[PDB]
Ligand binder design. Structure first.
Ligand code: ILE
Ligand code: CL
Ligand code: CL
Ligand code: MG
Ligand code: MG
Ligand code: MG
Length: 348
């Protein structure tokens, strides 16, 4: 027999770069585990569903995975809105759901069936404030945020709380926008030392593109939403200079053997570079597979995940606390000409 595992990922739509990276990293882990004999001698059977980057679809897909497909665990969604919309449906069926990358604070509170593989937005905002203040030496900044996003708003809230310099402009945009001219024009005529942009790649990359196009050269700093090659494609490699952003995976600073092995394996399998989201998803599959060893049913997989205190993976350790959260190493990436040239370990 087999062990059924569902994927619920943003494989198409506005968040596709994130979910597709996770699909690739998760599938690589499954393939390897299967080649090595499966779990308890059972092959992993994947039911891979695309949530289209939509919250209602993420919810519907979860119901179908847990009640029709009758999967034992779900990996994904990648993003916070979708994860928040999926959790109650997994919970009703008593199936654990692990999001490799949903950073919304408090998402796991009281959620016996939700696990989060990454850090939180409060942590991101604090790191951004510390970095722009102490490393970019910024006494004045522009804050430009996706107002249609709880993710972006959470990072912005934390940033404002921590930052002691002057926010000279606190402007907005919304997901789906493709024109940022008015706001950028308004910013240009003001002295500032950096622009902090909480948001996702479709908007952030276009913002970088347009800012640099109109002569704004100062540092543009983002949260984890800046990861991936689609951000660089939107910005264009030329304009993707003086860019800094948070990541949970680095190929150069304090690089572990597991990170090296994953980079090599992903390149061999896909002939592409992995993002931090592929790395987190690869670890999430291993966390579930390990938890499935000796598990008689889905509640036991959940219990076993909750007892995971010392897992070592591609993204360092995973050690779940009582709230199903794990501390994770974070890096501030330095990007020029669309390439990461430096990585610095950072913490609040
Ligand atoms: C892919 C994850 C994204 C960038 C974000 N951390 C979220 O929670 O929505
Ligand atoms: Cl553009
Ligand atoms: Cl400038
Ligand atoms: Mg398929
Ligand atoms: Mg000045
Ligand atoms: Mg090899």
């Amino acid at each position: 027999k087999t062990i059924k595992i569902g994927f619920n990922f943003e494989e198409s739509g506005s968040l596709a770069a994130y979910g597709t990276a996770e699909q690739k990293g998760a599938q690589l882990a499954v393939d390897e585990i299967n080649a090595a004999g499966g779990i308890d001698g059972k092959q992993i059977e994947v039911v891979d569903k695309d949530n289209k980057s939509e919250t209602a679809e993420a919810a519907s897909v979860t119901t179908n995975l847990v009640t029709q497909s009758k999967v034992s665990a779900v990996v994904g969604p990648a993003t916070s809105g979708a994860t928040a919309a999926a959790v109650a449906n997994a919970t009703k069926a008593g199936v654990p759901l692990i999001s490799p990358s949903a950073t919304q604070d408090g998402l796991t509170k009281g959620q016996d069936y939700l696990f989060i593989g990454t850090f939180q937005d409060s942590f991101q905002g604090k790191i951004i404030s510390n970095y722009v203040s102490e490393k970019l030496n910024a006494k004045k900044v522009v804050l430009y945020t996706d107002n249609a996003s709880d993710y972006a708003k959470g990072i912005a809230k934390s940033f404002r709380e921590s930052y002691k310099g002057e926010i000279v402009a606190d402007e907005t945009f919304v997901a789906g926008d493709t024109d940022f001219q008015a706001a950028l024009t308004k910013m240009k005529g003001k002295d500032f030392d950096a622009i902090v942009v909480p948001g996702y790649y479709n908007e952030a990359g276009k913002i970088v593109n347009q800012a640099r196009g109109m002569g704004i050269d100062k540092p543009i700093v983002g949260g984890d939403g800046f990861n991936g090659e689609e951000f660089v494609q939107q910005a264009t490699a030329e304009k993707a200079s003086n860019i800094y952003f948070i990541s949970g995976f680095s190929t150069t600073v304090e690089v572990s053997a597991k990170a090296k092995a994953f980079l090599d394996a992903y390149r061999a399998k896909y002939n592409e570079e992995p993002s931090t989201f592929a790395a987190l998803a690869y670890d999430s599959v291993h966390l579930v597979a390990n938890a499935a060893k000796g598990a008689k049913n889905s509640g036991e997989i959940k219990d076993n995940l909750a007892k995971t205190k010392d897992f070592e993976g591609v993204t360092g350790q995973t050690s779940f606390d009582a709230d199903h959260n794990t501390v994770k190493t974070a890096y501030m990436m330095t990007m020029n000409n669309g390439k990461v040239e430096a990585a610095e370990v950072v913490k609040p």
